[PDB]
């Protein structure tokens, strides 16, 4: 298998970056990639065993490192905003027909970091109409004012983790689409059945887990700190 | 580039065949992968045909490859909805070890409606009901949803979902401000037999 870490990050201009990737498949290629829009993957580094790497198609801004046969280092010692995007790491064996991805590394380089903000959560009761129209309940979540986009939405119902009857955005929209200082908003929806929200002892909560700033970095803003951390809404059965 | 891809996004109803485009420049590439990735996840690889071969057939899915033109095609046989993700041309001198990737497609499938009802209901906040939301839905995939014409109103694209206990599937659209549902998504088409309570 291919871990990155971390799969989240956000750091400042200037600031060291590394991504690290550690592979248990026993492969002696590995490689880092990043992904863009209208620039689909492109070669970082790569490394044909330990103690080895090679410049890949944009290595301009990154160094590499492979110290082991299952480590795999992409570093960045001078981060800059052009460097924010989503690192892929893979592991290939001589001549292999495939190469064993990663699941990725969403990397923001802010520069300011005063425009990092966590969600506000909010749920929406189903609507009269369509409770006696269709038979059916949308719980409708709404996580607005964020930023980066770095997040996880789901819904729990009686505090268990539900998939069906559920459906997210592709991809959160920009509040303000001039700025792309913007910050973000999501939507979700939730559907059941107009008895099962006719149920006052059913609750429901919309959660997103918003990906922020570690701890140990420093803050000199009034505001709370935007960490990473669960921002939830609830709604109970009527 | 090195290796180019069309269309930049290709949707396709279920049941129907998919047609993804590649070509490349480079004629020592021996080898030409297709990675598939789905939202929030890595790319893997799909299906893959070597330079010597012209076809390569999968189960629904089949490569076509042309030497000759520099042209490569994927066939995707009665495109399903989780078939709905981002396709990745690539290609390799070293048997399939070091990829230079094209853009990539993106593919969507969209749903049959059985019983297609249109409406757009309002929807309170559970904490303050001075806020609330305007939901379109029960809508066929045939609609777009556009976005907004302004600022300070907004639109969410379309999401369908599936309620699993039954059987039933439901085409969903979000809009909010802060105005009227009545007004909310006039920038889009509506059926004429929308429901508005």
């Known amino acids: 298998a291919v871990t990155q870490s971390p799969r989240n990050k956000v750091a400042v201009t200037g600031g060291k970056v590394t991504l690290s990737c550690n592979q248990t498949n026993n492969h002696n290629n590995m490689y880092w990639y990043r992904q863009d829009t209208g620039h689909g993957l492109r070669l970082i580094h790569y490394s044909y065993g330990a103690g080895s790497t090679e410049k890949g198609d944009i290595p301009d801004g990154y160094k590499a490192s492979r110290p082991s046969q299952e480590n795999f280092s992409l570093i960045l010692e001078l981060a800059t905003p052009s460097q924010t995007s989503v690192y892929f790491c893979?592991?290939?064996?001589?001549?292999?027909?495939?190469?064993?991805f990663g699941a990725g590394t969403r990397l923001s380089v802010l520069e300011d970091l005063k425009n990092v903000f966590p969600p506000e959560v909010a749920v929406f009761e189903p609507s009269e109409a369509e409770i006696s129209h269709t038979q059916k309940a949308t719980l409708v979540c709404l996580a607005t004012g964020f930023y980066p986009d770095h997040v996880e939405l789901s819904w729990w119902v009686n505090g268990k983790e539900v998939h069906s009857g559920v459906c997210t955005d592709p991809q959160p929209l920009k509040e303000q689409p001039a700025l792309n200082d913007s910050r973000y908003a999501l939507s979700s929806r939730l559907r059941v059945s107009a008895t099962f929200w006719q149920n006052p002892r059913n609750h429901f909560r919309c959660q997103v887990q918003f990906y922020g700033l570690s701890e140990n970095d420093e803050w000199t803003q009034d505001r709370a700190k935007p960490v990473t951390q669960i921002v939830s809404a609830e709604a109970w059965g009527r | 580039q090195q290796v180019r891809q069309s269309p930049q996004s290709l949707t396709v109803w279920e049941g129907e065949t998919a047609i993804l485009n590649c070509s490349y420049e480079?004629?020592?590439?021996?080898?030409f992968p297709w990675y598939q990735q789905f939202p929030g996840e890595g790319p893997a690889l799909l299906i893959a045909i070597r330079s010597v071969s012209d076809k390569k057939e999968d189960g629904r899915f089949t490569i076509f490859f042309n030497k000759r033109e520099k042209k490569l095609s994927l066939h995707i046989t009665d495109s399903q909805p989780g078939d709905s993700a981002t396709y990745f041309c690539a290609a390799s001198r070293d048997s399939g070890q070091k990829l230079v990737f094209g853009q990539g497609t993106i593919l969507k499938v969209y749903l049959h409606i059985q019983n297609p009802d249109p409406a757009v209901y309002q929807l309170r906040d559970s904490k303050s009901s001075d806020k609330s939301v305007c939901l379109f839905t029960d809508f066929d995939s045939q609609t777009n949803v556009s976005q907004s014409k302004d600022s300070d109103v907004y639109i969410t694209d379309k999401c369908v979902l599936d309620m699993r206990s039954m059987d039933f599937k439901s085409n969903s659209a979000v809009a909010w401000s802060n105005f009227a549902c009545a007004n909310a998504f006039n920038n889009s088409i509506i059926p004429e037999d929308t429901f508005f309570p």
């Open positions: 480079n004629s020592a590439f021996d080898y």
């Open positions: 893979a592991s290939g064996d001589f001549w292999g027909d495939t190469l064993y």
